[PDB]
Design a binder for this molecule. Sequence first.
Ligand SMILES: [Ca+2]
Ligand SMILES: [Ca+2]
Ligand SMILES: [Ca+2]
Ligand SMILES: [Ca+2]
Ligand SMILES: [Ca+2]
Ligand SMILES: [Ca+2]
Lengths: 207, 207
Amino acid sequence: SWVWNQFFVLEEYMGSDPLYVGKLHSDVDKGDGSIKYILSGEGASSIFIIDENTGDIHATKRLDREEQAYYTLRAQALDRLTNKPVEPESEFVIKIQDINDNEPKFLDGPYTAGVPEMSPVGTSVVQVTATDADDPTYGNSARVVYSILQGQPYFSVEPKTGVIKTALPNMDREAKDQYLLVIQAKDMVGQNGGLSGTTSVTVTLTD
Amino acid sequence: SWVWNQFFVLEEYMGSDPLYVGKLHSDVDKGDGSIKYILSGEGASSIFIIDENTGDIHATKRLDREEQAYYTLRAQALDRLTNKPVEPESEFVIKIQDINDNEPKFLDGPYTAGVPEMSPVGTSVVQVTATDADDPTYGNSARVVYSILQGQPYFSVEPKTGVIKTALPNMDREAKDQYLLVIQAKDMVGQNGGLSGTTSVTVTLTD
Ligand SMILES: [Ca+2]
Ligand SMILES: [Ca+2]
Ligand SMILES: [Ca+2]
Ligand SMILES: [Ca+2]
Ligand SMILES: [Ca+2]
Ligand SMILES: [Ca+2]
């Protein structure tokens, strides 16, 4: 079945005029005001208000998707005289639409890892993980690309997975036993304008 | 029935970023990308574009409610592999929301009229009419109030109907047999921020 019972409103609005969310409407409504539209549920009468005559919903404050990403409300349509329902009460969702306002963050960083000296090229060393609190299903605001800022050509990193691998054969611990890498994670899939985060990786060569 | 299959776009958007309209979704969609969402109908694949994977719809150009107020489209959900439907098609509407961007106009102006001299106060002279291309069905963007800018105290105008009337008694043709009035029509029922238009009325005193 098609799912239609959802509205959205953009997060982090800084204007003074309340944002318009949408309109509750019964097709029984003849435009004569005899139906009263009533809002209940999450944020109802506080964050979200309704005009009982027109069904228009507004949001009354700046909203943060990363605080709560959506709200589940209920809609009623009552006859003004009798207060009896003209429609069955229905749930509906108000979705908080994402903007890219969070940087990728390496929450478990910094990293340390060991790898045997003289490992073959392509040996996995460690997987680093940047988390991006934005919406991974809308645009690229939470779609991250990994890169090595400092550490090429000795190591490589898989751009989508954050797995660091050895890149040079025949590393000698006697010559150099430790490497200090800087890894970047950048959203908007690394495109210009993306937000970024970084972490350090200390790689020790083990015998 | 509750009406949930209606999206909205505010007219006359001048930003470079395409305006987000909303999201199509079938509850057959398991989030694995096996469904393709497609649009057809008014504005499809030109004015309105869709991300086939996510169902997200954007508007690609500035729209004018006074050019077209509504777009009726069809949603389909297709199997990505076979291109065959996994839902019955469903109609939906994109409503273009009004802004007050048209001023009242006296398209049949200016006016000429006669009224007998020595008439009772409140004698009808002529009815002027301003039209306003904005949306009359809600709000005051096309609801006008009439006023006389030049021509008081000799004449008055009914603020809602535009009927111009004599205001002074014992008007004497021999003393003065022609008056030139300037009439204003202002939308937002004459409130501050309303747009305005004017016309003139040449009134002759008769027997
Ligand atoms: Ca936020
Ligand atoms: Ca982000
Ligand atoms: Ca966000
Ligand atoms: Ca317009
Ligand atoms: Ca207007
Ligand atoms: Ca308009």
